[PDB]
Design a binder for this molecule. Structure first.
Ligand code: K1T
Ligand code: K1T
Lengths: 149, 149
């Protein structure tokens, strides 16, 4: 069910890891900076996400997170169906690749306004979610979910 | 105005600080655990919040955060109108007091399922936002904002 489908995405910058969740139908994102991708960090990120939006299904970003007993525990706790992130539809790869490039571009544009990478990432999330393309990703996710309710 | 109005709230547990943002019209919350309330932490919290929901006005929780140059910078950056949290309507105090008590109750109910307080707080956010009272706070915030769009 489209309103509840999210995709995990992990990208790298400044020797750190940026963990991203994308709401597939809208392009809306949430992101955090972590020292490295672990099952524990991914699990905690999902708990946060699921308390904020009605997360039904998550396409996990890799096999280690898919396998992680802590990720499995969090998905159980939060009522999330854990699925693989295998792009059966092959355009899914390019969309995420493009989003990572786009996010890094925005991060570079704001980078000098913040001391810490985590702050620049949140500024980039803001800009991404507010950008009109016409509705913004923030507007689309709200409309999609409201219609579903 | 109503769709974009949030209230900051700071409460204490286990020698730590729980920073809460409440969407006044719906009762929907976002929360984080921090070692202590500083302007820096409050500012960062607001940047995160504003990238995720259309935050127009924030009733700050105290005068130190209202005054903080870092909080002011974040509100400027994110297009947030910073206001005081003075309850001209005196029922506002009791509503927040009650929410803090309610949150702590839920935290106590989940506390043994997580090692770390921050995790229990996110579990409590989840339970709070999903609880049907009939719509949940999560459903109400989405409806309110969608209608506004
Ligand atoms: C709001 C922005 C224009 C300036 C804030 C204040 N920053 C500055 O004024 C310094 C910018 C000069 N390079 C950024 C900020 C807010 C809150 C934080 C931060 C940072 C950050 O700088 O990363 O770290 C964690 O908590
Ligand atoms: C999902 C929950 C039932 C179990 C997770 C795994 N926890 C356990 O199984 C231990 C439970 C001990 N009572 C909780 C968890 C997930 C992710 C984290 C955590 C914690 C946490 O425990 O606080 O800390 C930071 O990152």
């Amino acid at each position: 069910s489209s309103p509840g489908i999210w995709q995990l995405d992990c990208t790298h910058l400044e020797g750190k890891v940026i963990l991203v969740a994308v709401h597939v139908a809208s392009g809306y994102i949430e992101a955090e900076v972590i020292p490295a991708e672990t099952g524990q960090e991914t699990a905690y990120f999902l708990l946060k996400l699921a308390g904020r939006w009605p997360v039904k299904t998550v396409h996990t970003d890799n096999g280690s997170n898919f396998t992680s007993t802590t990720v499995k525990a969090a998905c159980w706790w939060a009522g999330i169906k854990q699925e693989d992130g295998i792009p059966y539809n092959p355009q899914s790869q390019g969309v995420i690749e493009s989003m990572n490039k786009e996010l890094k571009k925005i991060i570079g544009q704001v980078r000098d306004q913040a001391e810490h990478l985590k702050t620049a990432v949140q500024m980039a999330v803001f800009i991404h979610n507010h950008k009109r393309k016409g509705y913004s990703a923030g507007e689309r996710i709200v409309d999609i979910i409201a219609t579903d309710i």
